[PDB]
Amino acid sequence: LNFPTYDGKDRVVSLSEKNFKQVLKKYDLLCLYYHQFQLKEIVLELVAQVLEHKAIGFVMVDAKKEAKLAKKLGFDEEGSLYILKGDRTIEFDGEFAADVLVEFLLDLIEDPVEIISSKLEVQAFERIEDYIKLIGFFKSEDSEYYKAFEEAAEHFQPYIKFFATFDKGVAKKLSLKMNEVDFYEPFMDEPIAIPNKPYTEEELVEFVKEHQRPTLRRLRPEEMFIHIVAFAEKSDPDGYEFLEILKQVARDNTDNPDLSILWIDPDDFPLLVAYWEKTFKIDLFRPQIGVVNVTDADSVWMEIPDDDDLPTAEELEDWIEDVLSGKIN
């Protein structure tokens, strides 16, 4: 009824060789913890208890003990959690926290392509604009073109959402031809149709890798970890009004390749944003936009001293042009 508390049962098994290959196909997902870390230890144990009846295995591979198995799987960062799914290895870079860890695994455990088979599902599909989407129309699951799409979906999972329909009327409502795939940028209404349908998986993966930095995109707790960062609480009238300004500059510079704004809602990352306040020495719980140096963590911020008078889209774009050209950093 209330919140789960860890019961003491040790579910994080230690994985040796020979024991390895049996457990990779017993489960959908394997969580491998590569080796004072009682905080990271106890989070992994509580997630394993809540998911003890999901098809997810929780193991730990010691750096010194199973150094054989860590070299066999390519474990670089010690103290990091790696997710194995079939032939693929996913390094978790999010916050090592029970909320964030559960959501990542449950995103990863499902099929990488969500199938839309109803016309009423198309309206809800079209209104969801916060992430990159792809959608295709195929004859059936057995098709080589769906398989290529399915294989491409697996390569980007769970960071980019893939969709398919097998219905002529649904595809008619999406204005999709047979074996065609539409690409949706975040916060833009009109999709991009990938040229020269039908597509192989190498054609799809190469298209998505070119289009991986859209003009505006929303940070997620899954996908994370020079850099233009915008801060706006959508739940706050101030941050929402600033977010609406950011959307207008995103739709005015779809031509501009040197513009990629990362919007961070502080309500989605309350611990991370508060910590960055200590690093960036600015109030990030009100509308802000800045550029951050990846190395030195230096930053310069647009002057928004007065949130009852936020910049217009022309003033944001002019500030952006001064930042891209070279104002300070």
Added chain:
Amino acid sequence: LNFPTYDGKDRVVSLSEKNFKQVLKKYDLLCLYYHQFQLKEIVLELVAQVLEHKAIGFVMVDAKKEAKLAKKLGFDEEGSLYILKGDRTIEFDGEFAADVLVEFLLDLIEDPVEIISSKLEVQAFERIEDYIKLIGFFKSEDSEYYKAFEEAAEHFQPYIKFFATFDKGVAKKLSLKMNEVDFYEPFMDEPIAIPNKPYTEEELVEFVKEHQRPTLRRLRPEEMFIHIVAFAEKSDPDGYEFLEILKQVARDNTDNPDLSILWIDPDDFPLLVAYWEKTFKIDLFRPQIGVVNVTDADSVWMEIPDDDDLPTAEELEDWIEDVLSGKIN
């Protein structure tokens, strides 16, 4: 740049008497931990570290030692976190986690009334529909009627959001008369004006307490802890399409006082929803609506076996009527 890690410094002080009243006025907020709990110990220490330069004090009150101070403040649940703000006592009932705890305190630390002073902020105010809102128009902060609204806002903090404007043009755009207060239900566009303005604080608090159970409302990680609960991932076309049906049933029974739907997005509560799957024996990460018994934790769920054919609002409403009238429990 990356995530904060706890540095070893012990900031959770132990608070005695006489030392008490100095630290209550030294700080804006007092976080009191009432007494194997190394998990709760380490979460509180990281939050105190991240917030070490905020006007927030972190203390712990042992049940047996400072039982004097625990009796003086009224601490019932051991292992619970209580937030003190001036004359007010707030028991934290949410997940004992750094993300949820940080967001709660930063919600509590700000002024309970957010002032809107720009007409462009009014459009953004109107699009934020996920929580109860109140907004009033007063002459200035010095007015006795603003003081009553501010005192009412402090009384519901941080669970219900209060707003005020002091500007004639903003109020005209809000269609607010002077000292008038509008009441906003979640997911309903038209506010309710509280009758017989101007209002005392008792007049406002009593109005809000009658109207605290609206037809549809979204759970928050702050405010939480017979009951119709709906499960819908807004980020998923299935869950979004289901969310759109609930809004339609919400607008059809604004008359019905015995209808109060709690929408829980599984993406907002990944640990709690996965845990409830084990208690309710249902896949809650797809569209669901059920009624839960508060005592026995029994539940009965509307049958949604086929997510390509979700119920319409009439079918939801008919299911609701069988549940309110008496179908099963």
